[PDB]
Design a protein around this ligand. Sequence first.
Ligand SMILES: Nc1ncnc2c1ncn2[C@@H]1O[C@@H]2COP(=O)(O)O[C@H]3[C@@H](O)[C@H](n4cnc5c(N)ncnc54)O[C@@H]3COP(=O)(O)O[C@H]2[C@H]1O
Ligand SMILES: Nc1ncnc2c1ncn2[C@@H]1O[C@H](COP(=O)(O)OP(=O)(O)O)[C@@H](O)[C@H]1O
Ligand SMILES: [Mg+2]
Ligand SMILES: [Mn+2]
Lengths: 81, 408, 655, 163
Amino acid sequence: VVAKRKAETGNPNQIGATMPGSVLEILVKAGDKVQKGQALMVTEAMKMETTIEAPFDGEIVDLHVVKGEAIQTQDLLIEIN
Amino acid sequence: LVPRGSHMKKLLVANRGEIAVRVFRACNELGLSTVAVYAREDEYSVHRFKADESYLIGQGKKPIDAYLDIDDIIRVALESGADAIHPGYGLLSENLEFATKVRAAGLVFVGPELHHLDIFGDKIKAKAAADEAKVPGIPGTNGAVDIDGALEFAKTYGYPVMIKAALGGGGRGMRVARNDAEMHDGYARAKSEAIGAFGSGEIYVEKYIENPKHIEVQILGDRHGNIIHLHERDCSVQRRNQKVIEIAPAVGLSPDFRNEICEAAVKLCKNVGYVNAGTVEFLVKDDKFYFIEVNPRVQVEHTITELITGVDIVQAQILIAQGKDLHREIGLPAQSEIPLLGSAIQCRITTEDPQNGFLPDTGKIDTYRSPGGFGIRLDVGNAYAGYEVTPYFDSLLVKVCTFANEFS
Amino acid sequence: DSVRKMDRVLHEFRIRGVKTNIPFLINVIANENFTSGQATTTFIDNTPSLFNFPRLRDRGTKTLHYLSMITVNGFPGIENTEKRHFEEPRQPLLNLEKKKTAKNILDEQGADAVVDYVKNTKEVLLTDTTLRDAHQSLLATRLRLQDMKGIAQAIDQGLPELFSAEMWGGATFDVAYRFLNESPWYRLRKLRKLMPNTMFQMLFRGSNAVGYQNYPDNVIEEFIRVAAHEGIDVFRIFDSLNWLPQMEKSIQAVRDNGKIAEATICYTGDILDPSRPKYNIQYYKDLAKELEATGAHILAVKDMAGLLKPQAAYRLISELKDTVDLPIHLHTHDTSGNGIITYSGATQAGVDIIDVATASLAGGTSQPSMQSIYYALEHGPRHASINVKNAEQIDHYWEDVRKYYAPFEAGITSPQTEVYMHEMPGGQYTNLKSQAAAVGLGHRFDEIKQMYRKVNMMFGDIIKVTPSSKVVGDMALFMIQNDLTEEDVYARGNELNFPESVVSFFRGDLGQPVGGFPEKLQKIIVKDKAVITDRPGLHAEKVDFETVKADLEQKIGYEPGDHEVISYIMYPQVFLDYQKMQREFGAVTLLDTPTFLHGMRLNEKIEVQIEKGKTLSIRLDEIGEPDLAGNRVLFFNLNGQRREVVINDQSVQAQ
Amino acid sequence: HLHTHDTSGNGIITYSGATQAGVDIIDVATASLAGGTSQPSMQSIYYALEHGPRHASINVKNAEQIDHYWEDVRKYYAPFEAGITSPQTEVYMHEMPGGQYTNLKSQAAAVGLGHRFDEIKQMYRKVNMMFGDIIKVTPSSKVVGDMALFMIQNDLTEEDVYA
Ligand SMILES: Nc1ncnc2c1ncn2[C@@H]1O[C@@H]2COP(=O)(O)O[C@H]3[C@@H](O)[C@H](n4cnc5c(N)ncnc54)O[C@@H]3COP(=O)(O)O[C@H]2[C@H]1O
Ligand SMILES: Nc1ncnc2c1ncn2[C@@H]1O[C@H](COP(=O)(O)OP(=O)(O)O)[C@@H](O)[C@H]1O
Ligand SMILES: [Mg+2]
Ligand SMILES: [Mn+2]
């Protein structure tokens, strides 16, 4: 079982899963410039839907999940610069 | 007459532990910001993290000396911009030098006037003041004595007698002598402890009363000539003359008699113009009562008085030090109208091991689960999961009070 | 009171690991509908202000993120090694004398009065470079505010005799932001308060201040206004090619702001070698007269490579003193091992002020030792003006602090007389070493020093100080790397792409050098790019402070001070990258240096002073092993709470 | 034939002074093993005198090339480095030669007085005066050290010894 990379605690450049669930849609890709509040991805927990928003302006560095992939709390979703 | 500079925005507690946390809570409820001080060894004390800011004091000193470091505590008050120092209890809270220097540094000292710390800090001067006010005391040496005046007393009044230090506190400067040989021995050893613990060793003697109750009266006085009592407390449950359990009011005594005790305490405090919180302590035996001490500060057992009166004593202390009127601004009723609701009991839970001669244990607390519910009050010291109990300070973990309509 | 008690209680709760409704409860009881006692069943549903929740600050957590980063992954650009146990640095035992200082005079009577005080002083005066040039030379400019603060008061009180302390400018501005994640402005404010009686001196490039772009005049003027307002007293203004037009506006603005201007002459060559007459004594006199005519308060001679031998120092200073009336402030490096003797020579010739470092940060490519020059002159006709016993005590602190910076040491501190052959100032020497490494020519460095010297002559024999020294380096490197002689460059240069910095030099982007450019070589290098012959700042893209300020506020999410605006203009990307690092790691400036560089050891406890009245007591209890994806979990105790921190282990990830 | 150490940072200027006074031979170290408690630099003194009335006799270009070898070899000895090579003018107060300074450092450590070393340097100076003001070079320097150490460690003032 190769564990998923976790989001670093207190690192606001890294967005980690807040609860277990899955990735419905990915709205952005590596390289994209992005604005505070802009939607980056959508995830599900108990079939409730959450939209992951950019914490500030910056440039997407990389994604760390794929469409429809399962996720556990703290799993690293996306990195920003 | 209100001193200049009585307005407050920030207060500093020259103490630690439960009493510091108790004062911070009152301050916060009054809209004051707070400052803690801590010795290096006490750096994991809850009180440090409850204040709005905190500062290390006494660098390089032994930990208890750090808390007695008058100049360093004043340094912190001035550097932090504090207006006021609340000394809590123990430590420097009855110390004339400390209050003098705090006031000389332009800070409010939350406590009585210097004159009161002088006459009530010294137990000889206090008995003098009690005689002057026509409050019955215990037959005792006219002032301080050498061993010959002591023996003289025992000759006049008889054994047994209580040897007491002018500056004794908690029970450290006192010995019972039932004998000549115990008088020589007891006197020597009471003088040692008095120099060792409090830096001076003046000794007086008193008649030793057999199987008394210890009954004490809570007082508040403001700067506008108002004095009131918040009924009394029975603190007779002691071990080696150290309080273990306290109750309120004194449920085993008649209300007429308790009231008489309260009026005697008020009379004494009126006579000297007492300001702020204070307590008058009496020994009681067969429907007579005798003055022994005034503690011119708040006490550990104030909690039970708050519960049976509804009055917040620490808030009151702070408001009095800001120059406020007990009735007009603080909102206490007239004396006849002070509530008397139910009864209350306080126990102090400590690391004292009763199967090891009450030697206090040290080490890490693995588990700490605190109860609650109706009629329960907790004032925590240093106890939380993970906390390392050190050998440097007192062994108190938490103070527990219960309150109910009926004592049973 | 019941309401106050609730409010007290809600704020006092500490619950971690799950979210709670506490911030909502806090809003509800704050509201007047609730406190009046008049709320109705529809109150909450109709009050949207109850749902505005503040962002609650977490300095503690950014700290643990940083400590975890360094502990596990090391500090970038140095060896990831285990942290030594360091004692507290020694504090000095001073014998204080209260005296009026030059700073006191500047503030009470102005600049010309300071100049008069200098002229009337028989002793040679000293400027301490320990806070700027000494660590720029020896420790890659990495000396941190946190170490500077612990001794700054001692210097102010201890050594009132100092003319000044050199504490800003040069590489410090840039390096502070980019490598130390701390603001040079915060350094200036903090030291300014701790040292109220000491003149603060900066090194300032006439056309660029502390940057390397082409800034218009209004920027240079604004930098000076802010620096002066923030506590810089003496501005040493120099130009990399000793080109006076680059210096005139700066000098005027320093005067206009009520501060002291040193106009600088950079020394190169050898006034005693008649085979290199281009930089002969007449050159220096001529330029000194023109500098005097600008209204500069003091003339500085900047011997950036430590070339000045003691007989030349004597001749140079003595001639200059008979040519202008300004006091002369001489600055050298001890790179050749002749720094003390050169200063002593210059003292006999009348020099007014000299730049010295404290002993434990002196010698080698640093300045000569302050304590040493005292004793060199103690039995001469002119003494050095300093409290030497105090200076020796203070040196103890710097001796201890220097050990924290072991990973940044350039090598052993000893003489290197080959500086007379190649004329690289120290940074140019170390940097050029890194560059030859990164290209696999570390083994041919001695051919490179030889080429550096040839290139210098090829370019007409030029003044080599930042950034002109780099121009020479890049070229010499290029020429070795592509096996080129001077002949080759003249033969087949038309088909070669020369390094950026060289091209810019020959286009006139650094200004005009003494004696112009060699013509054919210029054509060859510049080919079709635009050449200017006037002052580059005349061509600078215009800059509107209101525009830039609004742009910046947008970018950092609060209203920037004038100092932030000027930082952003000076170094735009670096300033923005500093902001990102503040946001990730917080105020790392507050960490002790060994912690800043190495993180923490297992079972170690540290105290971080994050504010007056706030300290983070941090203990590292466990360092978990990495899983296969790199995840490591560290367990800290922070102010009596257990904290679990996840950091990614880079070594695993880059396996 | 004059021999000095550059401990105070005045070694070159002292050698130069001595050259004007007619000194015949001086003791110098190669640059990369010079300065600090070592001798003054051979290459440096050449250049200090180059334009004066009296020169140093050496092939300085060859000396510079040879110094490269020593610069490289010195790095192999990092673990034995006494500390950073820089000036220390307190030598004028205590007068310990360099080995006596480093050794006396180890001894105060081995007895848990590393933290009071500055009191020790002060005592070394007092002891020296106590013994009549003496020449301190091995082993007489050690005599002074052992005593100063003894005196601190047993808390004795000079009089205590006399008393
Ligand atoms: N007659 C004497 N009595 C006592 N001590 C004596 C002395 N003659 C020389 N010294 C000492 O030796 C140091 C070096 O002298 P030197 O002529 O070798 O080395 C000189 C020389 O290289 C240069 N320098 C000084 N005056 C010069 C001049 N008038 N012309 C050319 N060069 C000069 O500066 C260096 C430092 O000279 P500084 O006078 O500060 O330092 C002198 C001084 O401390
Ligand atoms: N004269 C006395 N006779 C009998 N018991 C006494 C006397 N004085 C003190 N005690 C005992 O010691 C306790 C503490 O008395 P106090 O004088 O207030 O000393 P402390 O300073 O320790 O509070 C009393 O409650 C009582 O139990
Ligand atoms: Mg008592
Ligand atoms: Mn320099």
